[PDB]
């Protein structure tokens, strides 16, 4: 069982890094 | 939400920003209906030494 793995999908961090990122969009307007 | 309030913000001051500009735009406008009054005022007041040394008239 990779179970180990369920854990380690939480990150996936640059998910809402990248969001994080793009919502930077209010800083340049 | 944070993004949000950010922006919101952001316009907010935009929306104040040009609240004042306006403002000031319209207070020299008035501004330069007095000068341009006192002005007027000011050369009554020269005529009226003028006036005041004709010793004859006045």
Redo the contacts between chains.
């Keep these: 069982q990779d179970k180990l793995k369920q854990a380690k999908t939480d990150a996936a961090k640059e998910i809402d890094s990248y969001k994080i990122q793009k919502?930077k969009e209010?800083?340049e307007? | 939400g944070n993004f949000k309030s950010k922006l919101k913000k952001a316009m907010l001051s935009q929306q104040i920003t040009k609240s004042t500009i306006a403002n000031k735009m319209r207070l020299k406008v008035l501004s330069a209906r007095e000068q341009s009054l006192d002005g007027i005022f000011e050369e009554t007041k020269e005529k009226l030494s003028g006036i005041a040394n004709n010793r004859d008239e006045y």
Excluded: A, S, Y
């Design positions: 919502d209010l800083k307007f």
